[PDB]
Structure formats: C-alpha cells, structure tokens
C-alpha cells in the first residue's frame, strides 16, 4: 500500500557546508527546487 516517505535536501547533499559550492549551484537554477516538489508529491500520494 504505502512506501517509505523520503525528503531529500538537494542544497546540503550537493554542497556540504560550502559557500563557494553553493554559489556554483545557483548557476544551475531551480533544478534543486524541482526535486523537492517531485519528492513532496510522492510523500503526499503515500498518505492517499
């Protein structure tokens, strides 16, 4: 019926505790944002 609900953080996963690495991630745009929305939808469907 249900599967493990997992929320992945693409800000910390990609760049650990790094300011320079973070600025480089901003160049790639909203990709990190899209991942959260995709996984968020999964977690919501698991409760349905």
């Amino acid at each position: 019926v249900s599967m493990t609900k997992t929320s992945v953080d693409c800000t910390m996963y990609i760049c650990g505790d790094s300011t320079e690495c973070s600025n480089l991630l901003l160049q790639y745009g909203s990709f990190c944002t899209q991942l959260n929305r995709a996984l968020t939808g999964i977690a919501v469907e698991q409760d349905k």
Binding site: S7, T11, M12
Partner: protein, 49 residues
C-alpha cells in the same frame, strides 16, 4: 525574511498563501567554536640542506 508567513510567500513566489503546510528552509545548527588538537613539533624542516 521578516516573519515565518513572509518566508512562505517568497517560497511560493506568491502574495497569497493557501491553507496547508509548506516547507520553507532547513534548520542550521552552527558550531560553537573551532577546536584544534595537533601534535607538538618545535623543529624546523631542513630546507637549507
């Protein structure tokens, strides 16, 4: 960054926040101070040789 309500507005990029729960950002715990434990060596390296 003003109040947790405004943070949701920039998170959604909309001035209207609909009823529900929305993830804003993470919770960062900063370190207290920098701790350093190293071996004690008073000898200078033989760069002259």
């Amino acid at each position: 960054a003003l109040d947790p309500l405004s943070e949701t507005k920039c998170t959604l990029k909309s001035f209207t926040v609909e009823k529900g729960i929305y993830q804003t950002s993470n919770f960062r715990v900063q370190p207290t101070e920098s701790i350093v434990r190293f071996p004690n060596i008073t000898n200078l390296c033989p760069f002259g040789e």
